[PDB]
Amino acid sequence: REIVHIQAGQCGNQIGAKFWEVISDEHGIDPTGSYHGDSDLQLERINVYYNEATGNKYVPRAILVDLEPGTMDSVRSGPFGQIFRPDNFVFGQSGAGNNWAKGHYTEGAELVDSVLDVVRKESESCDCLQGFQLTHSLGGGTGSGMGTLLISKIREEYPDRIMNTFSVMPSPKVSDTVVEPYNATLSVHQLVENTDETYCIDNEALYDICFRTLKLTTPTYGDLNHLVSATMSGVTTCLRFPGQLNADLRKLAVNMVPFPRLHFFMPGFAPLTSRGSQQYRALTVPELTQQMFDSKNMMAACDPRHGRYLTVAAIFRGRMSMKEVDEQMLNVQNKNSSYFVEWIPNNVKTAVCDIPPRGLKMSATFIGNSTAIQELFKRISEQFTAMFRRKAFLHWYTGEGMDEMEFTEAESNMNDLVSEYQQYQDA
Amino acid sequence: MRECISIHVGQAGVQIGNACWELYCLEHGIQPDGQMPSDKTIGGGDDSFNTFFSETGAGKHVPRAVFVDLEPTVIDEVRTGTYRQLFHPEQLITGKEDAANNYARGHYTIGKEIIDLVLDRIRKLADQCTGLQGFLVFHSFGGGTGSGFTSLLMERLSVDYGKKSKLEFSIYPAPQVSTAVVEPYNSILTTHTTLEHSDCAFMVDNEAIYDICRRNLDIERPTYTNLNRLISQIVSSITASLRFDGALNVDLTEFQTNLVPYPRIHFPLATYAPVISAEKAYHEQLSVAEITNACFEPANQMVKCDPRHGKYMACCLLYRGDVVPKDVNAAIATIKTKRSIQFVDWCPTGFKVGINYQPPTVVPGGDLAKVQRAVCMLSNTTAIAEAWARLDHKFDLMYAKRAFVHWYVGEGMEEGEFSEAREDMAALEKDYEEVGVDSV
Numbered sequence: 001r002e003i004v005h006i007q008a009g010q011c012g013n014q015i016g017a018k019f020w021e022v023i024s025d026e027h028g029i030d031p032t033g034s035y036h037g038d039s040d041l042q043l044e045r046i047n048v049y050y051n052e053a054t055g056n057k058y059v060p061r062a063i064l065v066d067l068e069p070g071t072m073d074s075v076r077s078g079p080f081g082q083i084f085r086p087d088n089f090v091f092g093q094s095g096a097g098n099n100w101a102k103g104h105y106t107e108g109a110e111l112v113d114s115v116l117d118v119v120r121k122e123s124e125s126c127d128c129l130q131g132f133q134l135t136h137s138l139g140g141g142t143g144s145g146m147g148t149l150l151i152s153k154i155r156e157e158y159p160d161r162i163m164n165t166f167s168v169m170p171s172p173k174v175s176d177t178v179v180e181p182y183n184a185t186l187s188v189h190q191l192v193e194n195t196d197e198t199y200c201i202d203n204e205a206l207y208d209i210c211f212r213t214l215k216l217t218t219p220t221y222g223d224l225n226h227l228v229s230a231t232m233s234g235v236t237t238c239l240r241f242p243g244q245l246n247a248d249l250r251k252l253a254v255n256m257v258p259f260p261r262l263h264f265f266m267p268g269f270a271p272l273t274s275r276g277s278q279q280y281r282a283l284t285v286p287e288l289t290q291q292m293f294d295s296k297n298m299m300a301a302c303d304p305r306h307g308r309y310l311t312v313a314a315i316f317r318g319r320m321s322m323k324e325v326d327e328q329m330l331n332v333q334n335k336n337s338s339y340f341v342e343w344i345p346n347n348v349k350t351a352v353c354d355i356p357p358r359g360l361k362m363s364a365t366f367i368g369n370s371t372a373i374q375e376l377f378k379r380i381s382e383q384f385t386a387m388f389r390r391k392a393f394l395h396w397y398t399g400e401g402m403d404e405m406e407f408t409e410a411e412s413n414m415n416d417l418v419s420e421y422q423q424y425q426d427a
Numbered sequence: 428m429r430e431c432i433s434i435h436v437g438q439a440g441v442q443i444g445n446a447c448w449e450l451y452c453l454e455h456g457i458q459p460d461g462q463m464p465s466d467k468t469i470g471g472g473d474d475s476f477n478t479f480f481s482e483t484g485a486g487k488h489v490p491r492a493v494f495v496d497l498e499p500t501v502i503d504e505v506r507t508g509t510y511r512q513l514f515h516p517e518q519l520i521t522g523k524e525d526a527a528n529n530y531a532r533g534h535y536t537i538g539k540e541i542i543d544l545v546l547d548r549i550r551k552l553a554d555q556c557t558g559l560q561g562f563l564v565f566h567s568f569g570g571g572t573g574s575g576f577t578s579l580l581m582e583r584l585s586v587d588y589g590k591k592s593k594l595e596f597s598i599y600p601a602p603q604v605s606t607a608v609v610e611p612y613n614s615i616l617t618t619h620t621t622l623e624h625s626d627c628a629f630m631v632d633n634e635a636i637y638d639i640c641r642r643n644l645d646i647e648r649p650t651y652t653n654l655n656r657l658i659s660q661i662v663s664s665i666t667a668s669l670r671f672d673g674a675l676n677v678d679l680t681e682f683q684t685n686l687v688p689y690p691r692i693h694f695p696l697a698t699y700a701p702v703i704s705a706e707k708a709y710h711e712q713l714s715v716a717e718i719t720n721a722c723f724e725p726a727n728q729m730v731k732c733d734p735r736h737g738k739y740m741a742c743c744l745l746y747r748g749d750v751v752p753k754d755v756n757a758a759i760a761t762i763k764t765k766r767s768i769q770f771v772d773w774c775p776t777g778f779k780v781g782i783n784y785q786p787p788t789v790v791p792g793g794d795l796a797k798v799q800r801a802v803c804m805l806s807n808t809t810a811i812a813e814a815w816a817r818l819d820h821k822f823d824l825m826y827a828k829r830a831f832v833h834w835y836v837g838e839g840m841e842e843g844e845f846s847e848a849r850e851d852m853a854a855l856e857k858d859y860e861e862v863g864v865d866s867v
């Protein structure tokens with residue numbers, strides 16, 4: 001039951017590379033692609049993310065995409081850079097200049113068919129392809145513009161497969177350019193229509209976790225990405241190891257998405273411990289559970305108490321009491337029942353995996369479909385309008401053939417998305 | 428790739444070109460004969476410095492540059508000077524008769540006779556690029572060639588290279604070193620003609636540089652040599668993002684995204700620090716906080732104007748040398764609480780920061796102290812329109828009497844071109860006023 005991974009642009013390829021480093025370590029795959037683990041539990045579902053090559057090697061089913069070669073050269077020379085299939089590096093030279101239009105309509109349009117050819121080659125080697133996962137940012141040009149172009153094309157050629165994305169939302173707190181709200185709004189417009197599941201990873205949240213909780217005065221993008229790759233490992237554990245719950249992309253979607261447009265998830269991770277003496281402290285299941293539901297552990301800068309949970313997936317990792325996990329999960333729901341919509345009975349599902357992540361004896365990853373996510377889109381909308389009011393910086397886009405109407409339409413649909421969340425928050 | 432071609436037009440453009448390329452060579456360890464011992468890839472490469480330097484099989488690193496002047500004596504000094512081996516003879520182009528401080532002669536009478544040759548030589552450079560990014564054009568506002576020929580060239584470049592990016596370093600006139608009464612005419616004419624053909628223009632007010640040399644370097648009566656060495660440091664700061672690589676080194680094109688909110692609003696204000704003599708730099712460490720604070724002292728600006736009485740539309744900080752993000756962030760925090768920094772209501776207030784680790788370089792026999800860290804701020808402020816206002820007023824005083832206009836008419840120009848140019852400048856001043864007004 002194969003998944004095809006795609007990583008687009010600078011952010012996409014950098015978190016993507018980190019993701020493959022992390023899960024390769026978990027599955028016992030070294031940078032050469034050789035298995036050197038001591039558990040058949042590691043290889044039982046390794047087919048989901050890896051192709052088996054000659055010499056008994058394991059090759060990520062991963063396609064690396066960018067409109068400039070820079071970041072992908074750094075991936076190639078990175079720790080696990082050698083593991084990737086060289087034919088799956090698809091790149092241009094021009095770059096996208098943080099311009100959604102360039103990624104979606106001009107520069108990316110020239111490269112997209114090359115990417116689709118590689119996607120097709122990978123899909124053809126699948127016994128039964130379940131779908132796709134894309135890693136990208138929404139604030140740039142390539143990951144945002146070309147990434148959503150790719151998603152549209154893939155849906156056309158594979159309309160009955162699941163589309164999943166890890167989408168990094170822009171924040172003024174951690175920003176490269178002022179046009180990020182434009183690029184993001186244009187992208188959300190695409191994601192609302194053409195994905196089944198989207199993990200909303202807010203750079204604002206990643207920074208605040210690094211600053212407040214982890215006590216890092218000056219976080220780099222690399223430190224932000226450690227949080228993302230750890231979270232990505234967690235949310236895909238059910239796909240990568242034997243289990244009952246959300247074991248594939250479609251079953252997850254059926255459990256998490258009560259209405260097709262409302263498929264934007266808040267991910268969370270625990271423990272998040274600052275360095276010092278307490279880093280060695282043993283964590284209990286009650287502490288894990290409380291922290292995983294804590295807003296300060298969420299990867300989307302939204303207050304869960306400002307909305308209601310439609311659905312929740314929780315996944316615990318490591319050796320621990322299944323009985324204790326069940327008891328604590330029930331405690332959360334029963335002690336905070338008003339925050340879980342009563343018109344979706346039993347909307348919290350829990351999985352437990354024996355294999356813990358590197359450097360932790362136990363951890364917990366949170367996936368919430370909360371109406372509080374509307375705060376995220378409201379933020380982008382306000383930032384969008386502040387500029388669009390005066391048509392500021394629009395010439396970068398109109399120069400690539402876009403019209404103002406397309407901005408108006410993107411904004412309206414994102415505002416519709418927000419009001420749809422508010423509807424069910426009040427229901 | 429992402430090659431950049433520099434075009435140096437007229438005396439000011441050429442002489443500033445000399446100072447810039449000398450500095451570049453010293454920054455990259457390139458000798459006057461073009462040899463670069465540290466470059467192990469002979470005859471080519473795609474290193475960061477290759478954006479500005481091509482390479483010959485014999486190991487020569489050659490500026491991707493063309494020098495153009497309508498008289499020979501300035502460029503002749505390049506041909507016989509220290510760095511004569513640096514340039515191929517075909518890169519240095521001269522006529523026999525200059526524009527006589529007349530825009531008309533630079534754009535029409537004299538310029539037309541050499542424009543095709545210039546374009547052919549530029550084409551020769553372009554054809555050697557594998558991914559040409561665009562052009563940097565150095566010129567005065569006040570000269571006949573700097574004004575007239577530049578605008579002709581910019582028009583022709585838009586035709587032959589489409590929307591390929593074109594940046595300017597433009598020398599704005601000051602009475603302390605100006606050489607023509609009609610420089611306000613030439614300034615308005617070239618600004619009007621070039622406006623649609625330029626993506627971004629860095630104005631350099633000669634009076635600002637003059638004042639800085641007098642006050643900060645204790646130079647009693649600055650010469651062009653004094654002015655140009657300072658100007659080169661500022662140009663270097665701006666281009667360093669293109670010529671060096673580093674994890675925190677933000678490309679100029681990315682700053683441009685923030686700096687140009689509308690096509691006509693493409694004139695960033697540059698502020699540079701530290702400008703300090705060796706005598707005063709001795710046993711004096713200027714910290715990140717100190718040089719950053721100096722960016723909001725208007726005395727350190729490249730153009731005389733007062734941002735404290737205008738509104739910001741962007742603020743970019745380009746650091747070079749011994750600088751880490753921690754210290755930058757602390758410095759900016761302090762400034763946010765103390766200075767007069769008001770943004771328009773339609774743009775974010777965050778400062779965009781780039782850091783290049785290669786430290787600032789100085790030319791031997793120069794006036795600037797060698798420092799461990801420097802910064803160039805690029806801001807988009809409504810205040811820069813002050814520079815337009817002053818020039819336009821000088822223009823109006825003379826044009827109301829049609830003083831000197833017969834010189835332009837005699838070379839085939841019409842009064843309609845003057846009024847058309849002036850009207851465009853009036854609209855431009857109005858544009859800078861409008862962007863500053865609050866939203867509904």
Ligand SMILES: *[C@H]1[C@@H](C)[C@H]2[C@@H]([C@H](O)[C@H]3[C@H]4[C@H]([C@H](OC(C)=O)[C@H](OC(C)=O)[C@@]32C)[C@]2(C)[C@H](C[C@@H]3O[C@@H]3[C@@H]2OC(C)=O)C(=O)[C@@H]4O)[C@]2(C)[C@@]1(O)OC(=O)[C@@]2(C)O
Binds near residue numbers: 222227358
């Ligand atoms: C940035 C620096 C903050 C990164 C560092 C290591 O790779 C990261 C280790 C990670 C650290 O977590 C802390 C400080 O509480 C931190 O990563 C963060 C803060 O995001 C480090 C030092 C460790 C210690 C992890 C083991 C264990 O899981 C605990 C913690 O990670 C978590 C989940 O909090 C590691 O051992 C990590 O190696 C770097 C190199 C950094 O310097 O730049 C990076 O790219 C980095 C994140 O890899």
Ligand SMILES: Nc1nc2c(ncn2[C@@H]2O[C@H](COP(=O)(O)OP(=O)(O)OP(=O)(O)O)[C@@H](O)[C@H]2O)c(=O)[nH]1
Binds near residue numbers: 438442601610651655
């Ligand atoms: N900063 C600086 N300004 C200069 C320099 N040379 C000339 N200028 C200024 O440029 C203006 C005159 O234009 P020039 O460049 O000398 O004239 P040109 O471009 O050669 O045009 P023509 O001689 O009329 O054909 C005056 O305002 C001068 O102060 C220089 O080397 N450095």
Ligand SMILES: Nc1nc2c(ncn2[C@@H]2O[C@H](COP(=O)(O)OP(=O)(O)O)[C@@H](O)[C@H]2O)c(=O)[nH]1
Binds near residue numbers: 008014015139143221
């Ligand atoms: N977490 C994270 N965010 C990034 C990284 N690089 C860029 N971003 C964010 O992504 C946006 C810029 O998009 P980017 O991927 O660089 O542009 P692209 O290459 O054209 O897709 C901004 O909102 C950045 O804050 C990264 O390494 N990590």
Ligand SMILES: [Ca+2]
Binds near residue numbers: 467468471482
């Ligand atoms: Ca070389």
Ligand SMILES: [Mg+2]
Binds near residue numbers: 010011140176
């Ligand atoms: Mg980027």
Ligand SMILES: [Mg+2]
Binds near residue numbers: 498
């Ligand atoms: Mg001259």
